[PDB]
Amino acid sequence: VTPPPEKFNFAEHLLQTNRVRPDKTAFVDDISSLSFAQLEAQTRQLAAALRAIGVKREERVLLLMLDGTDWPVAFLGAIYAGIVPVAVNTLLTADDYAYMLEHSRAQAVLVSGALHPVLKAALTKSDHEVQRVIVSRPAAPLEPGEVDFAEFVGAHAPLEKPAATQADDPAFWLYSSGSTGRPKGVVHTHANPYWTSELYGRNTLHLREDDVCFSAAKLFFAYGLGNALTFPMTVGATTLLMGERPTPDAVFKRWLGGVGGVKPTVFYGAPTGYAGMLAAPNLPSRDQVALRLASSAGEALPAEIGQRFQRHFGLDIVDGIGSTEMLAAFLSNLPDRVRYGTTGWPVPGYQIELRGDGGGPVADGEPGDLYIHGPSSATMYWGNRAKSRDTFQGGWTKSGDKYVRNDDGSYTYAGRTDDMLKVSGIYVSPFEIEATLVQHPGVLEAAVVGVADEHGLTKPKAYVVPRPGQTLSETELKTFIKDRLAPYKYPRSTVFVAELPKTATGKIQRFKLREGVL
Amino acid sequence: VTPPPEKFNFAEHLLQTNRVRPDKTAFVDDISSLSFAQLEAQTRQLAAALRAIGVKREERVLLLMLDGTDWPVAFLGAIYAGIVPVAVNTLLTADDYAYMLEHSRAQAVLVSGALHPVLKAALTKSDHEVQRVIVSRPAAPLEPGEVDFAEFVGAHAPLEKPAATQADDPAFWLYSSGSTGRPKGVVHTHANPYWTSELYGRNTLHLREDDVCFSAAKLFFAYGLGNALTFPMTVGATTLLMGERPTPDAVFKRWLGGVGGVKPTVFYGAPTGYAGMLAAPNLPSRDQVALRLASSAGEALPAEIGQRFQRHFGLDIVDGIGSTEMLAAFLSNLPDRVRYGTTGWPVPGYQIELRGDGGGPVADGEPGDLYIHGPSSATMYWGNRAKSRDTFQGGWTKSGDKYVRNDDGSYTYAGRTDDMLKVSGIYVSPFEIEATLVQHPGVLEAAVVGVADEHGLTKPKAYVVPRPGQTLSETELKTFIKDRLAPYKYPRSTVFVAELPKTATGKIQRFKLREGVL
């Protein structure tokens, strides 16, 4: 792959790529569609609209939007103007967004109507710098200083030229959370999604123009941003977008061609979703679907899930591991080379190292800390030099995973170095769940560990010491955490215990709980 | 009142004041008591202990503690060492404390056991700098880095001398919320509580050594910090402290001498609490109590409440108004000169100015914005230069209240300039409540305004537009807000309306919601 030119605007790059196909559908959702021509027009009008309200090159805007045809307009329109969109999870709390508004110094917000109430709460409580709120598909009356997204776009003539950015300039941020502390602002450059889209989307998955791409992973996830925006636009594929939660039935409806007149040929999701679909009584037969490629990321794919999918559909699931920091997969199985129980082989263009307790080589078959040297690495965590130093060191990026290299050069996941769990393919901190549990008045102590379920998928498990003299049932605890935590964070079971194993010092010996001591 | 010397440590000042009375009870609560000599010992030992764990002069520590004998030890111990305690409301959420930890850069936390769960959650989610957590009255096992308050104090010999602070050096912070944005870190000097305790506690209230002081307002409130710490210690009075919620029954128990063998002679509370007590069927008769003085702050005192108190007890309620920024009352009725329906007269030592829309004078009987020139003003909002400039206007402090001056020189509250609500004597932003309500899926729009109850006391009232096609009941909304707002933020009622009154641009006509148009 040839490097991008040093003068490079990623949005203009994707627009230019598709000037050969102006009338092909770029994006389609339940209620709307954009050809590549329409996408370019709306992208450049939104770029002008943001400039017209005073947002300047290198300033940030918060992009808080459900998947839908407005999402790539917002993302690419900001980037075309040299404005940095901060693309964020749509399932967070008002306090999370308040932090992100202050930390990013966002100058405007592009928000789905369904998400306006949580954004409103975030605005009210924070010391933010938001000059304008642009609401895509409002679900309630607008306030002054608020404008409808379609009117905002339609009220401004398209920007005549993109900002004269360099390839290594920041282009967008994503946020990623560790086991403690605030979400970290992961800074990606214009070059980084070129590298992922060429090295992985094109050269590994072999996506092509006649594909129809559909990702259960939403666009704010690094994984979904490639799957359903940067990869398909790089090759001219058509992309199906879906705002609603990706239940098996919602996914099947689209596989069967229920939206946009198109049947997806490429699907992407997490192993948990593949397990849920395989368990579904109305799982489609392979003659009903047009899938030619099934991608997975976000947690290790249990071998039996892949084998069951392959037996049913005659298609493998192609498991690869990326991260927010590396943007897309750096280890992956191939469409025609799949070893279940492993994450496959290094993606060409990426160098992989396993390092031991002194930073040196580990022997084959032995676990080591995974480090990645590749051209798509984020540059830093914005405003956090200490965590940046720990992670981005001289061309290498520390993943926080442990891996084992097998004799065929494949890599087998061996756990984390930082207590984080990957549940439904999404990062969950056990410490957050514990801190929620101990706020119930009947809970004295709580410890949360990851346990593999009947399909080998890790779910949280809570061990709770009740306060003596209080009655506390499993159902009341379930009720307590229902609206306090997002559903993927729910402990799969709770065990009430009389005490927790602690060192002579008071630290919970969580390994004894994973070993089943209680 | 003689100014404090330029070299001045407020904690040393209060300790030195009471060396004449070492064996008199300084503080007593339900389970413990401290004489003035015991208080001095523990104060100076805690000061040494904080220095030993590496907290330096001018660094902050978070003081998150229920009222009890350990509270003045924590507050005065920090100040004696030159460490700045940040004394905070005990009813807030983990999100609230996470921000306070980050903004104050607190280096340690002194926390009541009952508040350890919410602190634990705040520590886990925040980018804090907390090195050690000191737990007063632990209610669960300690974690590493955590130490019992009594053990911590007991492990260190008393510091020999106070830090060599200046009268105008920062001594402590309180946090003050506005109608939007983050709570503001109000910075008070060593001199400031000297001035309030001399000008108001001694020279206006005439507190004296044989008083027993008891405040329904907790110690983290500027009002309570004077009532039940700086004022009584200035004159050698004994203070009764109570950790639990100040219900009528809990207050009455203490009035009648149920704790510490002492009957309070001076009571302080909010008009809402006085109204609740006067309605109670078990209101004590005046021969049963030792009250000689009844102080009120936090919201305007309806004349019917004061008249009813006076008819029953033969005591007036002495209403004054202070602020977090001015630390104690700058307008007040006097013990023997009360005009109900007003906040009385300027406290000698404070200059009062009412200013109109152009900053000039206003005629008697006309409302103006209230400004205070007095020696107890905070110096700044830490880290917020813009709001500091709008508020601390060269020697004058803007209150954000409107007031009318009457012909006899008294002052009558005329409303806020900033839509804040004073409910149960406590600041509540209606915009915060509104933003919580609209996050219910059945709520389309909401507006919260202040409406008088049957005692003439302002409570929040919610006007809610339900979402069409959803079933939403007052009962369901009541259950929703139960656990996401503190009880004093509960709307007294909720009216469901088809539509809210708005201007041509969509802005809610909140005055007509108070004017009753719906």
Numbering used by the authors:
A (entry chain A), B (entry chain B): 6 to 523
Which of the paper's sentences describe this entry?
BadA catalyzes the conversion of benzoate to benzoyl-CoA in the metabolism of aromatic carboxylic acids. Its catalytic mechanism is shown as follows: benzoate firstly docks to the active site, where it orientates to allow the carboxylic group access to adenosine triphosphate (ATP) for the formation of an adenosine monophosphate (AMP) intermediate; coenzyme A (CoA) subsequently comes in to substitute the AMP-activated intermediate resulting in the formation of benzoyl-CoA. The solved structures show that the benzoate binding cavity is rather small and narrow, constituted by several bulky amino acid residues including Y228, G327, S328, T329, H333, and I334. With the purpose to allow acceptance of various bulkier substrates into the active site, a double mutant H333A and I334A was created.
The mutant was examined against a series of carboxylic acids. To our surprise, most of the tested carboxylic acids can be taken by the mutant to form corresponding CoA products as opposed to the wild type that cannot accept them. There is no significant conformational change between the wild type and the mutant as the root-mean-square deviation for the 394 Cα is about 0.3 Å. Superposition of these residues and ligands for the wild type and the mutant BadA reveals that the overall architecture is almost identical except that the volume of the substrate-binding pocket is increased by 96.7 Å3 in the mutant. Three protein crystal structures in an apo form and in complex with a 2-methylthiazole-5-carboxyl-AMP or 2-choloro-1,3-thiazole-5-carboxyl-AMP intermediate validated the engineering rationality and synthetic practicality of the modified enzyme.
